[PDB]
Amino acid sequence: GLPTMNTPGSCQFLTSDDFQSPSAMPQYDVTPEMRIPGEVKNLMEIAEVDSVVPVQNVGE
Amino acid sequence: GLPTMNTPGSCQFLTSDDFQSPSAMPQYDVTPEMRIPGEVKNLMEIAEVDSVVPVQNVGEKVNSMEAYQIPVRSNEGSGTQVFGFPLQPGYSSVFSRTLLGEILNYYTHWSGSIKLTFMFCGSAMATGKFLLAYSPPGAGAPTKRVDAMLGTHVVWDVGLQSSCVLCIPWISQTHYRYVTSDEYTAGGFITCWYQTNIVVPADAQSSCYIMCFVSACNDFSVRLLKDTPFISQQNFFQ
Amino acid sequence: GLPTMNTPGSCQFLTSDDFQSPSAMPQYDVTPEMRIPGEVKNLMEIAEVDSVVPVQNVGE
Amino acid sequence: RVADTVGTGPTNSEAIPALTAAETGHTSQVVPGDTMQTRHVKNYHSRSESTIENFLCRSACVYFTEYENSGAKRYAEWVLTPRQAAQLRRKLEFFTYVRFDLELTFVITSTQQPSTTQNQDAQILTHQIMYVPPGGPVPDKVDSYVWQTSTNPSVFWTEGNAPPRMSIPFLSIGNAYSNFYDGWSEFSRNGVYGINTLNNMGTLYARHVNAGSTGPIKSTIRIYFKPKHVKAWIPRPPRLCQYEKAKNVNFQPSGVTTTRQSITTMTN
Amino acid sequence: RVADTVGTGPTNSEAIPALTAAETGHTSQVVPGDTMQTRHVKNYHSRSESTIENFLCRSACVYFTEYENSGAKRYAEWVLTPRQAAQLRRKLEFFTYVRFDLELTFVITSTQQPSTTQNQDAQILTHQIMYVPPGGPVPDKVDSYVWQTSTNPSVFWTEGNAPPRMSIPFLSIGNAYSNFYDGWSEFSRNGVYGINTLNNMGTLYARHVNAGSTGPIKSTIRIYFKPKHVKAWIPRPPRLCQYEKAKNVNFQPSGVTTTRQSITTMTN
Amino acid sequence: RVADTVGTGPTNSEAIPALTAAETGHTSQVVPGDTMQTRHVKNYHSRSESTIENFLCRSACVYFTEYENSGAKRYAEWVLTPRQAAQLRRKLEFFTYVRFDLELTFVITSTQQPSTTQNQDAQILTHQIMYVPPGGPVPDKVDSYVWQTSTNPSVFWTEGNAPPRMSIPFLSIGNAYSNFYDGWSEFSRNGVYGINTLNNMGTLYARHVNAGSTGPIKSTIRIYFKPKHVKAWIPRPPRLCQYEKAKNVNFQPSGVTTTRQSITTMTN
Amino acid sequence: GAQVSTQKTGAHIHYTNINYYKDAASNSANRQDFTQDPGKFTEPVKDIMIKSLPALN
Amino acid sequence: GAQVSTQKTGAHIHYTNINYYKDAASNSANRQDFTQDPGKFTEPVKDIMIKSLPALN
Amino acid sequence: GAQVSTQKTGAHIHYTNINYYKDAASNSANRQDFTQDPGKFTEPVKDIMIKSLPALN
Amino acid sequence: GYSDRARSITLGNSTITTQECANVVVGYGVWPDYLKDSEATAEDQPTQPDVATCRFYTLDSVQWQKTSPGWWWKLPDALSNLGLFGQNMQYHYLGRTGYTVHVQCNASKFHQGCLLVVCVPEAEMGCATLDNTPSSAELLGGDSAKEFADKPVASGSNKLVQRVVYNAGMGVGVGNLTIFPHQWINLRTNNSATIVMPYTNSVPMDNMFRHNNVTLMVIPFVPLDYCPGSTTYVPITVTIAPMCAEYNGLRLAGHQ
Amino acid sequence: CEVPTRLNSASLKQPYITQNYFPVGTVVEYECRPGYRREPSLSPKLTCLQNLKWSTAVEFCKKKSCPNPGEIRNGQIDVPGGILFGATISFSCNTGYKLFGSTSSFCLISGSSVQWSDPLPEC
């Protein structure tokens, strides 16, 4: 027994956390990745493309 | 006290985990291992051995040895059909009970090539010629020899060798196919046709039988583990 | 807080386990060991000595 | 880190950075210094909260179902899908193909249903959650033989502890998960049309391992998805309408935006 | 990793890879390239979920029994066997001889039995599970002297925590466990025939250490086996029939497979 | 590791390994090869589960007592001894003098005693266990001043957690613990005869720190001993009779063994 | 086999990480992959279009 | 005495492990033993049968 | 100051141990002391008795 | 310059010439050998007759009719009363022996059929009645063959053995029996089958009388057929040769 | 032994349903319920074991198949759940053709076999 001490925040679920968890399917062989065109590594790449602006949003 | 913090997933039992636990019998002297013949280090080694295929599972023939015999004969025609079944190694009634199908029914996905070996068990005086064909999906099963000719076929000549091997290759659009029935992961159709005829001499039986053996090639693989749908139980066996 | 995760088998008592525990009498001076004749380091040493066999265990 | 501004001065040249041609379908790469005089600014701003992984890596409730310890409804069953809810579905349909590992969390909460039974005294409830891949023997009852979970993964959770959680691999026969599918399941162009063709992820079951008390208790299980290690391709425009069915992309037509008083009005 | 395909072209030779002789009892080692033209494919597929250890290393419920805190049934007793259930038994009888360590888990759940007793107020229940090897003094009652567990291994578990679990060694006088035995226990060829000859693994007992409440509570214990470090020899065909008795291999005769409309029918 | 057998052949010599003289009180060191022809066998068998430490290092219940939260019996008191139970006592009396550290565990379980009191609602019970060495002020009541434990070691345990456990040193004025004593306490050869002369290990007390509820609850404490780092000397024959009193070695005379039909009968 | 990396700090510090599971589909999500390439979607024209130059010539 | 090994990763990363118990029948199950040998069951004939050659000659 | 020792394995692997308390009467029990000496109890005669020789001469 | 169709096997004072046979099958890739001094347990010196016990023994023939289901032989109990092999097996307590099985069946170019010869280790057999196990007088008969059945044996109050050929008496598919060392006799190709089997057990030695290591089963998958005018009596003969047999534990004769 | 196990495809024969007493070693027999064909491989018999429990029961009958719905003219048929006993196929017409008749067709049991009671609409 290595003496420890739980700290406030123990046994809680935070939707935005980052921990390792035990796999439910051990040693699963994942199907490899083919090169698919148009990889997105950032949302800002999308925000920099042109988009038509509805200026005349007046009535119908 | 070294300050720690429990994380979600603490104090839970997962049937598929991997941790160390305290022994209930410490320093137990385990009896040594003698060399026993036939060690198995992988399930796929078993799935690669031949297994007789019950093609004629029609009616009462399953309560016999007749489910295993493919009944060819001598007829006044050319181009008729012997048998036919779909490429589902673990779902179709023809394949769901061989060694390969029995191993498959424990796994969600499969991939690789199939071997189908046909052995002629007629007389040594009977001679024949057959067309064994595989047709991938997209059009229905062929209804005539000419339609089947257009797929992947082999012409089997019954000579001194008694066996021929039709190798069904991997022509999937994905990498893996579902063992269970699924239209999206379609496999194809396997058929046999009389290339010529079974010519016998006089005083020799004209009705003969073929036998089919199913094996996996060296590029076969299976994926997610699942429970078999075959075994069942209502109370604890005592 | 170092994030940990309890595993099945936590907070249990097994009569045949091996862990370290906190002493109730810290720094107790244990009386030394004199040489006493007949130390036994194994039960099999006892099982190898002769013992009279009651063969005629018949009746009274 | 975002690009720093470059100081510029006046200009009387033939270079025309402003005038371009949008027909070429090319976005202009103009900076503010081309059209005005600027100063040198060093920007330390970073695009770190804009990575696709960070954007999609947050737990979200995808479904919740209820079961009891008495009566007809003794266990709960859900076919796994990420299209039951609106929020994560819309976040995920920014892209055509995605590929991620999964982190699964469950939040189970019991509640004493009202009853005339007296001398009630409950014990600690224990729940079992089981996963059946396609082709498994689905439970037909609560005291069935399939809850032995010989090969099917299962978790046992006693009430009053940190919520259960496991990690799921890609688990797809395809090289990437598809959020959209333009086609049918049969080669004859009939049957199931759409993304329902590719959804074969299995089924989930939940039950009480014991009854606990002599009084009825209803337990609710909530399922939380978290995508980890995400790879995305082919970005698509966001849903303008409101989702109707998870199985189909059927929608009710809606205006392009909201309206304002006049084309020269600065108030919505 | 599975073998990669080798590209092949046309052929007009005397080599006959297709024609063979099945009588020799030898499986053909033919690849698809022998009978057709192929391309070069590099396969990254792995046979990692096919290892015998991975296949058998999953917890499975082998038995469950119930005891009470009042009345005649105050403790529970089970002679250890892996043949009571169907799933792990069929998974284990793919081989003749196996050899593995064991991981044992228990899931204990109490339940308030209905009673007319009033002012019920329970305290935390504590359970004891004890293992008696062959030749031990078996408990004849709940308040017996043998629950002292001087040398017999025992565990004490209070309700409301992670389930108890210990590790078991091979514990076999034979060099390997036998799933099948063709012979009798007496040299005169009579008596116990079959695998019951070699099952002498001991007995398991479970009880409440306290009564807890003045109202009856029934506790159920479920036992989960997990084989670790498995070595298997002599593979055997899978059970076609349905198991009847754990002690004997007696079976009801069944068809070889299911039937279909015709030998040329592509629908089951 | 046990000695391996040595292969032997036939013999026609004057060496007489079989014939010996038992009068010398010397055990023969003969192997099977002296009296027959043998083969060479390599033995990997080990005598690792035969070490005295491993044999004695297992927890065993030595005593259990009960106290209440109302009435006259509000606390429990035990003078420490390992002779109250049979199993560990017989295991320990294989030797004359032993010397070990101790590992002490307690298992405390409450139980609601039946009462006519209504509206019962209990809170978490907390227990205190205290150790008083010889010469300490023994508690005369439950709300005494000695439960302050200024120097006496004490433990506080709340119900619903892992059982309490501490480590005890040799704590003996003698160089080794004695299991047997042939003599009296007074030099005049009268008074206490036997092993009770050397038992001065102190006293143990247990109580509820709070009452918890308005309804009576009876708590039972069980004490488990585990010898660690054991050194043993002078082996002695095992008890043929059944223990009667912990204080004295008084016994009822019993037969040397069990009887059989005849001196030539192979059935008990 | 511990990995020491840099934390997220403001402009104008290291952390330690160990993997406990043998699956690689169970490790913490990677929150530090700041890499951008808008050439695929923006400016996708076959012929390079220099900014100062007339788009149509 | 820690052991660093490789995790299970896709094609086309290390973990650390320490043993805490003294029995070796209490360690984690070995999930990485990818070794195959079908010669014992398939192709068990005493005389080698080359593929391209006639089985009976 | 960790101690690496060998586990209990079958015939025909290491563990790590650290002590956290300062008493030495609180450490794990020693389960590995395989040492035997039956000379004290068996064969206790003052004069050595060779096996093949006659006990009384 | 020879043909791989002919083959001769010499053991002790016996010799078997096949003339027309398929390649010999060797167990699990292992050839039978003696017990090693690092795997032994019994301390007394073993006996090795070598030539007296390791020779070809020819059991009594059976007849292959058109409707024959199949036959089975428990291998240790078939040679129990034959020659010096049976004698040493009775006196000794422990024995350990490998086998060579040579099944022979010949016919003309106008006869057709197919038999499966399978050596099944630990072939435990079920019972017609679920409550009780099958008797020895039912499971094994030496000096003769035991026959399978084509129809399920009636259940009731008996100690019979379920003999359905498809269930193989072991609740398994007869087609899946090709997991054990197996050879096929095709009347148009073969005339004999040869299988060499090593010693398989969870223990270094065992009592042959109370335990059967392997059971040899011959089953006609494709039936026998011919046209009227040709030979109607076609027998099947089985030859067994104990290999590297040794015994430990010499005592009184008999297995009582 | 208690009342024999209930199945979703088979029901006890006439002597067994009336019987309320089952000693050890008793065999009861099942029969296909309406709309279910019998699988030849499985035998519909259950014995009473010594522990007063029946032997493992597996479904002894399988659902029947209604005939092929055919091909409608100038329209399509969904066939969503397959063509087994208790199915429901839907009918539709192309742009410009009006459906006259029934909209669906359940597979029901008509006499000794299963038939589609609804007729085909014309459009």
Ligand SMILES: CCCCCCCCCCCCCCCC(=O)O
């Ligand atoms: C108690 C253990 C339960 C384990 C349950 C595992 C369920 C796995 C679910 C995988 C969901 C995959 C979602 C893919 C979405 C998509 O197609 O884009």
Ligand SMILES: CCCCCCCCCCCCCCCC(=O)O
């Ligand atoms: C509270 C501690 C309890 C400890 C109980 C230990 C029980 C050990 C059981 C061993 C089961 C071995 C199964 C062997 C199966 C086989 O013969 O193939």
Ligand SMILES: CCCCCCCCCCCCCCCC(=O)O
């Ligand atoms: C809450 C802390 C309580 C601590 C109690 C400590 C009690 C120590 C008991 C020592 C027992 C020694 C037994 C010696 C037996 C012998 O004489 O052989």
